[PDB]
A paper describes a structure:
The MRN/X complex is a multi-protein assembly composed of MRE11, RAD50 and NBS1 in higher eukaryotes or Xrs2 in certain yeast species and serves as an initial sensor and responder to DNA double-strand breaks (DSBs), which are among the most severe forms of DNA damage. NBS1/Xrs2 is a scaffolding hub for protein and DNA interactions with the complex. NBS1/Xrs2 contains a folded region at the N-terminus and a long intrinsically disordered region (IDR) at the C-terminus.
Author numbering: 1 to 7, 14 to 57, 64 to 94, 98 to 315
Write the structure that this text describes.
């Protein structure tokens, strides 16, 4: 997303909506007024971007406007590319205006498809396949989520932060139209992003992953042919992952394994059977984060 920010001193910030032609000046008719500076024209500078690749297009309408020390001629068109921030200095006393590209890509559940267009209109990208280039935010409704979902698994192991879906809907419903009405986008974002009632879990991502190390050296034996083929996610935690065509083929292996060998079995279903204890991803996750794994591993 594109954020612009500048400047009783009032810190103003605002999320740039695509295709809208924005403008900074002293004239009241601007979306973003700079007060208290005569070096600032009626309409001093304008800009709009459209759907990396989401570059910003600016055109200087004011007397003094400097980008990285090179000075715009009145009317000159210049652009800012979609790293870090970029600042353009305006006026005699330089008023420093900052344009940041915050490449936000969110992984969302399918029922929230109705919000994708809006999110993209404000530079928040969404995805449904866990794809390959990681996302920075996983919208998830765990524990109210499919029992053999790999999504929470993928994010927990990828230290991607997980937030309830109301976070997504509150952002679109509230802080988006309001950031316009009060030029404090940055404060709202950081309230919403640090507000705990949108958190799925009680610990920071990397702390969550820390609870994932008691796996240590253990055999994980599974009936599940998964999206990012599981073994990948768990190659991280350096764990012997073993897959079987039907729970038959897996029960075979247990007899072959020596006694007092530790294993758990990740199956379609939570239930005890043949003395052994069979669990699913969601139960394994939960026992890990809770620490109650012991009541789920078996030994031979």
């Amino acid at each position: 997303m594109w954020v612009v920010r500048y400047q009783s001193i009032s810190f103003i910030s605002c999320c740039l909506q695509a295709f809208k032609t924005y403008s900074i000046g002293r004239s009241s008719k601007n979306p973003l007024i700079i007060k208290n500076d005569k070096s600032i024209s009626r309409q001093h500078i304008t800009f709009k971007w459209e759907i990396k690749h989401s570059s910003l297009c600016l055109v200087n309408k004011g007397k003094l406007t400097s980008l990285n020390k090179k000075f715009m001629k009145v009317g000159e068109t210049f652009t800012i590319n979609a790293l870090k921030s970029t600042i353009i200095e305006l006026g005699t006393t330089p008023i420093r205006i900052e344009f940041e590209w915050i490449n936000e890509v969110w992984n969302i559940p399918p029922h929230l498809t109705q919000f994708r267009t809006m999110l993209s209109e404000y530079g928040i990208s969404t995805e449904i396949s866990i794809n390959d280039i990681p996302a920075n935010l996983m919208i998830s409704d765990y524990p109210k989520s499919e029992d053999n979902s790999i999504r929470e698994l993928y994010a927990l192991v990828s230290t991607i932060p997980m937030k309830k879906s109301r976070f997504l809907m509150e952002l679109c419903n509230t802080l988006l139209p309001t950031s316009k009405t009060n030029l404090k986008f940055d404060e709202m974002w950081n309230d919403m992003i640090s507000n705990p009632e949108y958190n799925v879990f009680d610990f920071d991502p990397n702390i969550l992953l820390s609870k994932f190390m008691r796996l240590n050296n253990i055999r994980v034996l599974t009936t599940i042919k998964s999206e990012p083929r599981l073994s990948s996610l768990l190659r991280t935690f350096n764990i012997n992952l073993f897959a079987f065509d039907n729970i038959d083929s897996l029960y075979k292996y247990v007899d072959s394994l020596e006694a007092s060998t530790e294993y758990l079995i990740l199956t379609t279903t939570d239930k005890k059977e043949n003395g052994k204890i069979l669990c699913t991803i969601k139960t394994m996750l939960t026992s890990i984060i809770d620490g109650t794994l012991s009541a789920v591993i078996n030994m031979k």
